[PDB]
mmCIF file of C-alpha atoms in Angstrom:
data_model
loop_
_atom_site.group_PDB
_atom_site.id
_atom_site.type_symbol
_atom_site.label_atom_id
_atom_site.label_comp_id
_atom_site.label_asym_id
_atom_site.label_seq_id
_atom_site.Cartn_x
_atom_site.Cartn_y
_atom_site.Cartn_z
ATOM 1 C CA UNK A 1 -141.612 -136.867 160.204
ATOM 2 C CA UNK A 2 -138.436 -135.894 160.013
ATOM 3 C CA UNK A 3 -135.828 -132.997 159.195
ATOM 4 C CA UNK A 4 -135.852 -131.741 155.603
ATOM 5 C CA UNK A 5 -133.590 -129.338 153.623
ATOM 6 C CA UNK A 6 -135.058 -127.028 150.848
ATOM 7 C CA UNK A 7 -133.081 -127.158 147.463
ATOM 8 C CA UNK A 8 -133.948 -126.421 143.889
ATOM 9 C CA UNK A 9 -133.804 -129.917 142.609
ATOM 10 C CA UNK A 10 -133.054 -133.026 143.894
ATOM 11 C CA UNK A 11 -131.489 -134.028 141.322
ATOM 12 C CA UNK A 12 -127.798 -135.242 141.364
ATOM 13 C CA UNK A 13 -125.222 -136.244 137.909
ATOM 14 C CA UNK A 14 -125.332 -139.869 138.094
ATOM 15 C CA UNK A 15 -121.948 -139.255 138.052
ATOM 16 C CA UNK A 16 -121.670 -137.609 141.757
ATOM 17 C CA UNK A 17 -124.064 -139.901 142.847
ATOM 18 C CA UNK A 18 -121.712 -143.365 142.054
ATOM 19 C CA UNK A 19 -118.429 -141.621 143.098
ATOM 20 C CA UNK A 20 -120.481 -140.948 146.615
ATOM 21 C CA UNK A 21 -121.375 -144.437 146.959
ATOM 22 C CA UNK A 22 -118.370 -145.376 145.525
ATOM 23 C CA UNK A 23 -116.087 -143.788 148.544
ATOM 24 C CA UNK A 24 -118.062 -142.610 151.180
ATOM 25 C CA UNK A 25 -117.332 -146.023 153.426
ATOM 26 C CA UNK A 26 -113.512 -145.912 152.829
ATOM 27 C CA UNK A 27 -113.441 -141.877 153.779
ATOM 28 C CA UNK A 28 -115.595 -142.385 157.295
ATOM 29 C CA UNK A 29 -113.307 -145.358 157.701
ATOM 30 C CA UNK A 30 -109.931 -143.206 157.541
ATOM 31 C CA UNK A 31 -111.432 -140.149 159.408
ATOM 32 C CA UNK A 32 -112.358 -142.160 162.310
ATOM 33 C CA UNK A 33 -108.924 -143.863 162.656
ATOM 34 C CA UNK A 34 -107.688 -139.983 162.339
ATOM 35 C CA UNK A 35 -109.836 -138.716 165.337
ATOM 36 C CA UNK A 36 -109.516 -141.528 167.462
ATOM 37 C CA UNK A 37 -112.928 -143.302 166.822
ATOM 38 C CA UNK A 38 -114.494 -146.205 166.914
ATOM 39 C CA UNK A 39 -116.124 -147.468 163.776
ATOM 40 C CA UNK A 40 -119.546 -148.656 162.874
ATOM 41 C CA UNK A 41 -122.142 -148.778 160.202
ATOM 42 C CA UNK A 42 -121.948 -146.193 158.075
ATOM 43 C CA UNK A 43 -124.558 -145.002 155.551
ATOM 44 C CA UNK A 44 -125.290 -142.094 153.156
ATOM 45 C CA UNK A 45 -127.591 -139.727 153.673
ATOM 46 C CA UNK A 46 -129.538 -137.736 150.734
ATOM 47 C CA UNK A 47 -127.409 -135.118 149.074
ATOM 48 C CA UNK A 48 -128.083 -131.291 149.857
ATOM 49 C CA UNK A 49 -127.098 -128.339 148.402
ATOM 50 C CA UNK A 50 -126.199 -124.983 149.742
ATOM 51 C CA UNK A 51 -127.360 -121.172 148.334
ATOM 52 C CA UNK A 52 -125.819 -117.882 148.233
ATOM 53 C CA UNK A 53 -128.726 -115.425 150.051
ATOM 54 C CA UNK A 54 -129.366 -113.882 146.429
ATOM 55 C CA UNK A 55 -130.465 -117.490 145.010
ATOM 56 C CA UNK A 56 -126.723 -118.634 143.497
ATOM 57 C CA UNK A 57 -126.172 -122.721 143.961
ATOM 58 C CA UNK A 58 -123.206 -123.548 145.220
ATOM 59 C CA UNK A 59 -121.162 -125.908 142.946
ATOM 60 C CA UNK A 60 -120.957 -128.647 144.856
ATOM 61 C CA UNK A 61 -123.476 -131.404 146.313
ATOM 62 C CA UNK A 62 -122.707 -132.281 150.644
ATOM 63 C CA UNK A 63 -123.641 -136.066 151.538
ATOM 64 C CA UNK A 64 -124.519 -136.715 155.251
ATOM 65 C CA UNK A 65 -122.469 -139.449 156.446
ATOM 66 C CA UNK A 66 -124.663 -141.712 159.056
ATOM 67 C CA UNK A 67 -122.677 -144.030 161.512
ATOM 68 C CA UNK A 68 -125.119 -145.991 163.386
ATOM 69 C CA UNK A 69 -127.825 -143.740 162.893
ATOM 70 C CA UNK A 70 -126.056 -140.842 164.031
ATOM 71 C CA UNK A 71 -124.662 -138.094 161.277
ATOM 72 C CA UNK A 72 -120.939 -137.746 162.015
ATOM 73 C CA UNK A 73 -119.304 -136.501 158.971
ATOM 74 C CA UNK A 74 -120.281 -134.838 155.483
ATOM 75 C CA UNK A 75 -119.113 -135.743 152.503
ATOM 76 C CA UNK A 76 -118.178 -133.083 150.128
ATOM 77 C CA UNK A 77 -118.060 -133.728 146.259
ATOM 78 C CA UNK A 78 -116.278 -130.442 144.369
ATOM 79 C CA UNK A 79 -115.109 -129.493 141.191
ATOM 80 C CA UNK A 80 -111.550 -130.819 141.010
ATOM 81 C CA UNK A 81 -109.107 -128.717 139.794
ATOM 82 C CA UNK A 82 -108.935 -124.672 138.177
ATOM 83 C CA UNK A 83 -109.954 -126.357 134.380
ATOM 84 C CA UNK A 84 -113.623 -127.929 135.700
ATOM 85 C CA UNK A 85 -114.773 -124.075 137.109
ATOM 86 C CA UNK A 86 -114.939 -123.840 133.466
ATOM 87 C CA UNK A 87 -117.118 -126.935 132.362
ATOM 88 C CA UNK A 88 -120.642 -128.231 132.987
ATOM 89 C CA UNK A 89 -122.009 -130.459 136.201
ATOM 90 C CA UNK A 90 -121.905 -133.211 134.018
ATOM 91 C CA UNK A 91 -118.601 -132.879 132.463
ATOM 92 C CA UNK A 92 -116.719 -131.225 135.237
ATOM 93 C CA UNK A 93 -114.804 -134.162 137.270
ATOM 94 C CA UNK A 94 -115.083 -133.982 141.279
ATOM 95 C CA UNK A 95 -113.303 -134.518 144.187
ATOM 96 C CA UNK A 96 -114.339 -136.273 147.095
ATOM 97 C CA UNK A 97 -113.688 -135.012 151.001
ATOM 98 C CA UNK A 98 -114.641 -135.957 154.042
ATOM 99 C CA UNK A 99 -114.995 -133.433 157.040
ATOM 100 C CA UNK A 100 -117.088 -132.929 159.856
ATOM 101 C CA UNK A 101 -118.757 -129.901 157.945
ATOM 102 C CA UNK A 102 -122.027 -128.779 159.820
ATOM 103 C CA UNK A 103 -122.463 -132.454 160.988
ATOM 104 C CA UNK A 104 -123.158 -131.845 164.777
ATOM 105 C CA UNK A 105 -125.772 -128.871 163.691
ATOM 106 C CA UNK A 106 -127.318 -131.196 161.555
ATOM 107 C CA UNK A 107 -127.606 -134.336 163.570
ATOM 108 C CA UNK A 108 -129.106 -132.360 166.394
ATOM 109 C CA UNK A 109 -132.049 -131.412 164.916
ATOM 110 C CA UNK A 110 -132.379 -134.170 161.985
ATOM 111 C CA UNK A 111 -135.464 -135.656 164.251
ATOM 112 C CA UNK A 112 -136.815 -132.733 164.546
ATOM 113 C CA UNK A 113 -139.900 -132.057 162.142
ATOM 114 C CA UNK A 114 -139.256 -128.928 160.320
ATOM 115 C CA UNK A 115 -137.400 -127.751 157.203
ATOM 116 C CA UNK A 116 -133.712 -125.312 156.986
ATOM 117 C CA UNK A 117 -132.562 -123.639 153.976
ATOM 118 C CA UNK A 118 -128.444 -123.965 154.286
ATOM 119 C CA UNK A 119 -126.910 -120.779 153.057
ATOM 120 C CA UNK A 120 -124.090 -118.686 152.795
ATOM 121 C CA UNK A 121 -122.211 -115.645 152.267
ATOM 122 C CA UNK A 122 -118.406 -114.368 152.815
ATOM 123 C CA UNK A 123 -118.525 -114.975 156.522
ATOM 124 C CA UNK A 124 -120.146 -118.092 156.949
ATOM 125 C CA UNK A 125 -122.513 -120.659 156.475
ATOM 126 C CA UNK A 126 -125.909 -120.570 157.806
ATOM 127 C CA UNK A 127 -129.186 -122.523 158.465
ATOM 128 C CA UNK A 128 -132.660 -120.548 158.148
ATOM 129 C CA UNK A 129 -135.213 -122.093 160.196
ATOM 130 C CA UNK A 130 -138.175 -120.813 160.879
ATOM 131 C CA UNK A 131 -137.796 -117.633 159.204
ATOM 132 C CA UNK A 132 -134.986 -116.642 161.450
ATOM 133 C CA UNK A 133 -131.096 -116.838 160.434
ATOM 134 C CA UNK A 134 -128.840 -118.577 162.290
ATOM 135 C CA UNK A 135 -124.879 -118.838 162.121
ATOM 136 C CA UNK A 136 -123.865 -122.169 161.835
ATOM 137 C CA UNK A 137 -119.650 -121.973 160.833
ATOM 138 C CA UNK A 138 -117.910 -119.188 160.338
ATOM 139 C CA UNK A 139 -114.740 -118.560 157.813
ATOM 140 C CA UNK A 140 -112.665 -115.630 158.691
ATOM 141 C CA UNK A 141 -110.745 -114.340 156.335
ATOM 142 C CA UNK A 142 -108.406 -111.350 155.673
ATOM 143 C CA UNK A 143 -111.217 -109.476 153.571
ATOM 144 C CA UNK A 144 -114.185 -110.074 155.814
ATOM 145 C CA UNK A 145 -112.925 -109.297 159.027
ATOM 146 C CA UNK A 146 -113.342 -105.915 159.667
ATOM 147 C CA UNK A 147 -116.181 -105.446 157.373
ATOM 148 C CA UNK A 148 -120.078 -104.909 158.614
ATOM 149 C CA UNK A 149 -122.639 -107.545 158.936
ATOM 150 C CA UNK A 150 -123.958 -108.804 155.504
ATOM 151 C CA UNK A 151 -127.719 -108.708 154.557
ATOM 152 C CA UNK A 152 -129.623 -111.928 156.182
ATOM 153 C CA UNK A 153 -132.350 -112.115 154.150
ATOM 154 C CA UNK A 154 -133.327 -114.602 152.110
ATOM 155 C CA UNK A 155 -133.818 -112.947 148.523
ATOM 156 C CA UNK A 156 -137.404 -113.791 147.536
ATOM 157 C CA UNK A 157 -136.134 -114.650 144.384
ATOM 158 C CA UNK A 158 -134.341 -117.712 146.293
ATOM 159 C CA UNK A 159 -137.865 -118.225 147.721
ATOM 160 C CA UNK A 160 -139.084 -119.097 144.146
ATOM 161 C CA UNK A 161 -136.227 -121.199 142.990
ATOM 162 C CA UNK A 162 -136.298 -123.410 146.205
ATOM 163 C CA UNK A 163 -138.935 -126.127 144.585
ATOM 164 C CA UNK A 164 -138.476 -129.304 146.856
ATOM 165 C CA UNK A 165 -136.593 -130.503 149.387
ATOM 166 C CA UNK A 166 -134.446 -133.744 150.499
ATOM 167 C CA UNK A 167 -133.904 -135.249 153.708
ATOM 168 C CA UNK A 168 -130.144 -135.702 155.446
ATOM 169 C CA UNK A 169 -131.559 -138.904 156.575
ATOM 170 C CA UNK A 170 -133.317 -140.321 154.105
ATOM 171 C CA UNK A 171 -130.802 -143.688 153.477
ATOM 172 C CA UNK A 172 -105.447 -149.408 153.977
ATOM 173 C CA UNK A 173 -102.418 -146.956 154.253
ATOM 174 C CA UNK A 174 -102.104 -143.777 156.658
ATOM 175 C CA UNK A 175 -99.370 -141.766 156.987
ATOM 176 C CA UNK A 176 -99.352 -138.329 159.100
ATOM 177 C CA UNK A 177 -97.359 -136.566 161.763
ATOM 178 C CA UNK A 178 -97.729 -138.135 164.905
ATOM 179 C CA UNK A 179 -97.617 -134.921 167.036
ATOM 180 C CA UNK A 180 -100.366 -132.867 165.140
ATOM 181 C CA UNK A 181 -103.094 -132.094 167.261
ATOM 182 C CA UNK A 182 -105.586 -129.656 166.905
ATOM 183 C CA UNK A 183 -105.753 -127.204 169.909
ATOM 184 C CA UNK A 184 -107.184 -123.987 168.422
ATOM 185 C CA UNK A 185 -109.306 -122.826 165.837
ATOM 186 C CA UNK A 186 -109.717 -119.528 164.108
ATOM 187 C CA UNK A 187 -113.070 -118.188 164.127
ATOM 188 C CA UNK A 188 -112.940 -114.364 164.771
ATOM 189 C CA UNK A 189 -109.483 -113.724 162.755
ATOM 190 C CA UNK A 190 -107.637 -113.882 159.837
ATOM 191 C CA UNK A 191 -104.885 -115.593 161.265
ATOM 192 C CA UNK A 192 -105.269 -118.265 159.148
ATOM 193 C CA UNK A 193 -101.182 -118.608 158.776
ATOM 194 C CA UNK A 194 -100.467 -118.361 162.398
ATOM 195 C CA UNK A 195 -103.003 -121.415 163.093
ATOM 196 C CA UNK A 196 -101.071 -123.342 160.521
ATOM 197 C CA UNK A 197 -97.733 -122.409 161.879
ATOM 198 C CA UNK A 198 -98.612 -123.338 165.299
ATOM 199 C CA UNK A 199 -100.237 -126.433 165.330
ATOM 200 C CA UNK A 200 -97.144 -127.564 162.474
ATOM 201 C CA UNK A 201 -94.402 -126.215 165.024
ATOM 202 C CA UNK A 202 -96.082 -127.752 167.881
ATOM 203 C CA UNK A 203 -96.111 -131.001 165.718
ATOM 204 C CA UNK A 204 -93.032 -131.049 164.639
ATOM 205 C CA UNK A 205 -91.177 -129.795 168.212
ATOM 206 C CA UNK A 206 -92.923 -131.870 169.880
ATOM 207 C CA UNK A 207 -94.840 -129.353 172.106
ATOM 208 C CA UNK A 208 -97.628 -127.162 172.920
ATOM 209 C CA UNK A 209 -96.316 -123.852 173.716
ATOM 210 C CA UNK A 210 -97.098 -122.178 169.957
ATOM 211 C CA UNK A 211 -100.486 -120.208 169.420
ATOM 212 C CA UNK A 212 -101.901 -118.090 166.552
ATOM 213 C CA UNK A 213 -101.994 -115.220 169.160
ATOM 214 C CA UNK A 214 -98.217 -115.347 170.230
ATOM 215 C CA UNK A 215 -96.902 -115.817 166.593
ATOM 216 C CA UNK A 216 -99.432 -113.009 165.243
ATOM 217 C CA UNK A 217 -98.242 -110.483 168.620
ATOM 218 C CA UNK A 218 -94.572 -111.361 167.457
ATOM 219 C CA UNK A 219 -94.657 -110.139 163.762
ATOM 220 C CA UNK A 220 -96.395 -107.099 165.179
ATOM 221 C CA UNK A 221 -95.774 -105.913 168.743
ATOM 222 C CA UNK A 222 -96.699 -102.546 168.241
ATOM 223 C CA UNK A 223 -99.931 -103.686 166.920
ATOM 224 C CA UNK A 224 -103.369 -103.021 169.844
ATOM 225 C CA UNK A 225 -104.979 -106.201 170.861
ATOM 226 C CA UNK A 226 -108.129 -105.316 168.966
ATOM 227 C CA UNK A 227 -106.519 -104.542 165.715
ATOM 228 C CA UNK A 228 -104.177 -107.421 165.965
ATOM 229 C CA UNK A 229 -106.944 -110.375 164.785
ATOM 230 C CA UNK A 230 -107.259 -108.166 161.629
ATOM 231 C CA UNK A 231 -103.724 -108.186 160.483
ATOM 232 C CA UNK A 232 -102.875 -110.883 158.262
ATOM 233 C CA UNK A 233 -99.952 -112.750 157.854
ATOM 234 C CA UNK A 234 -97.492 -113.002 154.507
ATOM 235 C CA UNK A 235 -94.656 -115.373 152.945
ATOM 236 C CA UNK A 236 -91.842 -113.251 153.980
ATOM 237 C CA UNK A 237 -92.940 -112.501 157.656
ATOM 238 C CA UNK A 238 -93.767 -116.542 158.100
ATOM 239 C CA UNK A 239 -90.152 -117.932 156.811
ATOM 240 C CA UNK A 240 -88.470 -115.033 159.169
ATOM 241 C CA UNK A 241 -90.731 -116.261 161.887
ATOM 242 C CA UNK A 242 -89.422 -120.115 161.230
ATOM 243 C CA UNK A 243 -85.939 -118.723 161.194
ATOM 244 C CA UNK A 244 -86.066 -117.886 164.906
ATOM 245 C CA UNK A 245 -87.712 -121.115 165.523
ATOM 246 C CA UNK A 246 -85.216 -123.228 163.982
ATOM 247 C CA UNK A 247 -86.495 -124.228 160.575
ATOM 248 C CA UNK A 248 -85.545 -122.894 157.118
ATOM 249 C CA UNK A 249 -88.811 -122.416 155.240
ATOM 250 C CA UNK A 250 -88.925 -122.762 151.793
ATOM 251 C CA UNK A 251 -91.568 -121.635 149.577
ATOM 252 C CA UNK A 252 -92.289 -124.697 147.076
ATOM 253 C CA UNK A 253 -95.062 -123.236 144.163
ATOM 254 C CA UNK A 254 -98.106 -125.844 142.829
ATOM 255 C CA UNK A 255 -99.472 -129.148 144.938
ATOM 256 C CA UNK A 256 -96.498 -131.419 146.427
ATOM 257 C CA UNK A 257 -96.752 -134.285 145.490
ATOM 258 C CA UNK A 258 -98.266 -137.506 146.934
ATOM 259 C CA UNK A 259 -95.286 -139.015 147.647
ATOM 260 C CA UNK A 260 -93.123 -135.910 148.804
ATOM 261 C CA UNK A 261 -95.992 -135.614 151.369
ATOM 262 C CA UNK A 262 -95.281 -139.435 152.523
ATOM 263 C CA UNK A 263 -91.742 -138.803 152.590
ATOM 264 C CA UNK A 264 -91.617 -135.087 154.330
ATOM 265 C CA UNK A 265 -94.092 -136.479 156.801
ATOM 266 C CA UNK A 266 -91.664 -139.162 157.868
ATOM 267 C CA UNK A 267 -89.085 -136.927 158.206
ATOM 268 C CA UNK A 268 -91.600 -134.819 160.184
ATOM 269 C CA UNK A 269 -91.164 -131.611 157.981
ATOM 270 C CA UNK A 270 -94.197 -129.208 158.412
ATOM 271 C CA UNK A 271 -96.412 -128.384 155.331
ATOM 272 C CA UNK A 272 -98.400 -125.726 154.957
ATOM 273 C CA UNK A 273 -100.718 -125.030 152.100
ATOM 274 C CA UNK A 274 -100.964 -121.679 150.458
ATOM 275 C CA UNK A 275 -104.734 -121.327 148.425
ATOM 276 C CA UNK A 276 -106.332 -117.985 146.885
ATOM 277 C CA UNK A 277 -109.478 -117.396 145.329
ATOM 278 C CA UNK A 278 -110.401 -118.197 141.893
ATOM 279 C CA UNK A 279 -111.597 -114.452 141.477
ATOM 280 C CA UNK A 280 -108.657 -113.120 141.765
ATOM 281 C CA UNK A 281 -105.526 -113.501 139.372
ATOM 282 C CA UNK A 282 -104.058 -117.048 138.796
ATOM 283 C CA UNK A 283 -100.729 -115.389 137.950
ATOM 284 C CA UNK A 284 -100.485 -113.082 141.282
ATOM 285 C CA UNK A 285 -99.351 -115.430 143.985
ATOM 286 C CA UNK A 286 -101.248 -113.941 147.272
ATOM 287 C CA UNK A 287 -102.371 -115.363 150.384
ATOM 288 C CA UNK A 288 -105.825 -116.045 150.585
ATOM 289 C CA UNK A 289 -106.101 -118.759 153.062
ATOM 290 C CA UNK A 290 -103.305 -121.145 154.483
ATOM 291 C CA UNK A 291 -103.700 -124.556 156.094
ATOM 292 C CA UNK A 292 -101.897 -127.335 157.478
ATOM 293 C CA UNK A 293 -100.888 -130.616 155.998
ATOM 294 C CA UNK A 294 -101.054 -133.589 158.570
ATOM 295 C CA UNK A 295 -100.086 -136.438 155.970
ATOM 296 C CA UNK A 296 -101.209 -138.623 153.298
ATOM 297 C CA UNK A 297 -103.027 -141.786 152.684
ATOM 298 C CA UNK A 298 -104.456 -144.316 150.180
ATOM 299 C CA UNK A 299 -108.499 -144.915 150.324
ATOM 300 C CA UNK A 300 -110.153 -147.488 147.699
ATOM 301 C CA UNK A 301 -106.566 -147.554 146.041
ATOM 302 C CA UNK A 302 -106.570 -144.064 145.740
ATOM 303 C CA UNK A 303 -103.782 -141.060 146.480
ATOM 304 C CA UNK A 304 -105.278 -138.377 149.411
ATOM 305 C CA UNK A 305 -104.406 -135.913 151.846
ATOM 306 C CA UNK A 306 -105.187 -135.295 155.017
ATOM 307 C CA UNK A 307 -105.145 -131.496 156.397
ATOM 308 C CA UNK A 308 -106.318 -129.275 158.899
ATOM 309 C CA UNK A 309 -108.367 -126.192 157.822
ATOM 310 C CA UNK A 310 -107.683 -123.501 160.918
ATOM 311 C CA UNK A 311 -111.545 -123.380 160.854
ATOM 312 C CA UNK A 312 -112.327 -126.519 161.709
ATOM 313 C CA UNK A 313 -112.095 -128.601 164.735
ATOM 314 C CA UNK A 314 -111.605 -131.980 162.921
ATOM 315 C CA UNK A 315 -109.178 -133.204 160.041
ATOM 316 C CA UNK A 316 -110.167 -133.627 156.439
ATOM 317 C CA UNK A 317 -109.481 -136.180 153.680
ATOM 318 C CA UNK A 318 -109.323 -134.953 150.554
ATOM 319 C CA UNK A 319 -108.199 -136.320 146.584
ATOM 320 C CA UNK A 320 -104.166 -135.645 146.392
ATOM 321 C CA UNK A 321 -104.664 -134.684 142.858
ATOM 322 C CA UNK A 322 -106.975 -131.758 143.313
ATOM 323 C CA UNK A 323 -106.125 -127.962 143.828
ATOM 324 C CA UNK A 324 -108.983 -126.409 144.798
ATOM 325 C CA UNK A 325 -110.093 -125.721 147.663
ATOM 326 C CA UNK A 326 -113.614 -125.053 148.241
ATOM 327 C CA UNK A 327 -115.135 -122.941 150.487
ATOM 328 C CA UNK A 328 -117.762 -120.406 151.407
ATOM 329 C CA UNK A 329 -119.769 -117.960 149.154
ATOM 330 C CA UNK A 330 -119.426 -120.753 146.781
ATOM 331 C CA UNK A 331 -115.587 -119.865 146.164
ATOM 332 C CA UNK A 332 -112.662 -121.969 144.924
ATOM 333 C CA UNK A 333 -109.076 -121.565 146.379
ATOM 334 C CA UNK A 334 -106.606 -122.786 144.308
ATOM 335 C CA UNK A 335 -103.772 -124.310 145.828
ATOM 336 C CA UNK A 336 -100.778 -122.808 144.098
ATOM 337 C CA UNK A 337 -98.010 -123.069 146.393
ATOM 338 C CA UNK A 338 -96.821 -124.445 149.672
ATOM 339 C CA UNK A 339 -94.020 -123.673 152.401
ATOM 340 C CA UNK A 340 -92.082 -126.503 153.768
ATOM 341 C CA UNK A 341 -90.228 -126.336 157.018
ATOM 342 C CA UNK A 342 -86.880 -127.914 156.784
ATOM 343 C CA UNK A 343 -84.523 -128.203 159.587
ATOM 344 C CA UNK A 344 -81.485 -125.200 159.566
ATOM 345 C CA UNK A 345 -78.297 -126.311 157.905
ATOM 346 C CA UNK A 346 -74.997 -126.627 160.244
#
């Protein structure tokens, strides 16, 4: 008699399913040592899957990750890089992340005896219970900011598709920079770049004086405080910024590599990825979203990242081969370039 979520199908590629089972222990291992908590027994939930409100699936299948009963994390399996957007669920290879996506909202009621329908559009994700739409995360971004409220209703063609349901509870190496902390988070701006910025200067100097706000009111300081969380932020503007703070940004294009991660890290260079949508033009470098690299590490023998999405109030593990990032309304970012913070020259 407890919490279900409505899907489609239950069904899952038998592929997704063993790389799940596969990892899931080794992520919630790592994530915990990254925010400072103590282990336990970990188990995987029953996989969910998320809708657009006009019926759309999104591409990729969420795993509740259960630590002594409790749901903690989620584990996120994606399409891996630009060329699987293009093949089949079957055929398309997937990442594997670990975040603390929607876990809180989730364990809260996953006792509870009802059913949700998780959804979302540009601005968000969102759980429908009861009939009524609720906001569960939101993902500002430079093209949804100052636009109106979308439509909350759940087509009733998504209605007719939704066919079953599952139920969330149905059951060695780490390298980052050992400043980063996570102090802010963006949820009612697009200053996706200054939240980067911030939290890698703060890292990287040592302090805690840097804030999305100050960085965004000092690129424009003619700019009213209610018009200022809807400017965005660009390449040029961010290595000028750096300039003044001591550190000769460099704009690096594709996905550094595992090992320049290790080694920048330990030379406690800031990273910050650069990602646009899919939609858009692959050959038209322009910012889409931005977030921060904290470091690297090596889970079940295999090469990942860890990062900090502005959004978020936890880190994220994620494969170090993969470029895409994947977000809300069922979009991809691509990761297609970086800027790296090196110290001036004398």
């Amino acid at each position: 008699k407890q919490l279900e979520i409505n899907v489609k199908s239950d069904k899952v590629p038998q592929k997704v399913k063993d790389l799940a089972q596969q990892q899931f222990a080794g992520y919630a291992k790592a994530l915990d040592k990254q925010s400072n908590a103590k282990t336990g027994k970990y188990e995987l939930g029953e996989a969910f899957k998320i809708y657009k409100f006009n019926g759309e699936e999104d591409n990729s299948y969420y795993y509740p990750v259960i630590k002594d009963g409790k749901i903690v994390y989620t584990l996120t399996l994606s399409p891996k890089n630009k060329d699987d957007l293009n093949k089949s669920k079957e055929d398309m290879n997937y990442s594997v992340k670990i975040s603390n996506f929607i876990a809180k909202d989730l364990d809260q009621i996953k006792d509870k005896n009802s059913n949700i329908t998780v959804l979302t559009d540009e601005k968000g994700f969102y759980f429908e219970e009861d009939g009524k739409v609720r906001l569960v995360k939101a993902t500002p971004l430079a093209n949804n900011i100052k636009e109106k409220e979308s439509a909350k209703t759940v087509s009733p063609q998504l209605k007719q598709e939704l066919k079953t349901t599952v139920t969330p509870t149905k059951v060695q190496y780490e390298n980052t920079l050992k400043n980063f902390k996570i102090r802010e988070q963006q949820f009612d701006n697009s200053w996706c770049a200054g939240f980067s910025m911030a939290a890698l200067l703060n890292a990287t100097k040592n302090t805690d004086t840097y804030n999305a706000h100050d960085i965004m009111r000092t690129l424009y300081p003619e700019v009213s405080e209610q018009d200022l969380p809807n400017c965005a932020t660009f390449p040029n503007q961010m290595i000028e910024y750096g300039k003044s703070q001591g550190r000769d940004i460099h704009y690096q294009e594709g996905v550094p590599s595992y090992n320049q991660v290790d080694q920048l890290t330990k030379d406690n260079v800031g990273i910050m990825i650069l990602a646009q949508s899919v939609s858009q033009n692959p050959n038209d470098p322009h910012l889409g979203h931005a977030l921060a690299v904290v470091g690297n590490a090596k889970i079940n023998d295999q090469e990942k990242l860890i990062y900090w999405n502005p959004w978020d109030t936890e880190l994220s593990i994620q494969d170090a081969d993969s470029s895409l990032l994947h977000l809300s309304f069922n979009r991809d970012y691509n990761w297609y370039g970086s800027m790296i913070g090196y110290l001036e020259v004398p």
